[PDB]
């Protein structure tokens, strides 16, 4: 697996990051947490995402990666 | 496993949180969590309405307030 | 735990439900039978909606759940 | 559990119910049930098509159809 | 059960019949079916692109086929 | 069956590829990665694309898998 190593590293060094969603919209802040269904995304508030309307997660800057 | 979605949902309809939820293809539901299980969200506004967590793609409390807090009870 | 239920109140007090699906369509009507996996929705005829289509059911009046 | 669907299909099936299916992506596919599984639809018209579960949204027979 | 997919791509991809393959989204991809298992079809045509099942709608053949 | 060697031949040989989403976009890079779930996908950032949004995989050139010898 390495959607744990992807989401811990973007977590563990504040890199904000950008999640498109299944319908297309953006939605933008720093990982604060993840579980097996969900990410919690911080910015103004934090709002709980559902990984299965996620499409992509795109890393504002290159992380060295696992 | 899952961990953050329960007590997220939990704590939001403990202290009657307004919400914004936004579904898979961009409509925006509002109002307060009554009750969820393992696969849909009960939500008040009108009436009360099922909703499909699959059909969820966002739940966004209307102010900030969880998976922070030193103490679990 | 919930959703049984829910759709048990519905059906057997004939109460008219909006359903809508994840395609933005609206379906009016009443629950005449639901399983696992599928809604038997009565109108001028009956239709069967997958739930996985369905992103709302919404009550024509509240449903009290014990 | 998995109690109404395979007896409603089946009765379009069986009965050659004109039927209209209506897609996640709102596409509305109309013709005759020729044949299902679990997992797909044989939609028959000029062409018999495959049409899978996971993308029906819903399926309205033309006529009143009345499961007991 | 599982029993119609397969019989239904396989005479398509033996055949070299066209297929419209509608995503979910409504997109038309077109192309013959090279191959396909449990989760993906191989669609040649230009390239050959792998179209997840998960993302497909229905499977029109260009022409009727004896199933 | 087919789709962890299409991806590894990917993967392994660098092949430029276009991955459309179920929303629409096309994204545009080389597979550096991937699981049963996921794709990281690299050009000015890896992004990590969930299959379940994946619609349609595109190389820029054509991809065979070698056909199995009896």
């Known amino acids: 697996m390495l959607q744990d190593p992807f989401l811990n590293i973007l977590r563990k ?21 993840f579980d097996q269904y969900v990410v919690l995304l911080k910015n103004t508030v934090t709002q709980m995402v559902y990984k299965h309307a996620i499409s992509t997660v795109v890393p504002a800057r290159p992380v060295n990666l696992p």
């Open 13 to 33: 060094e504040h890199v904000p990051v950008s999640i498109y969603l299944v319908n297309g919209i953006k939605l933008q802040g720093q990982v604060e947490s």
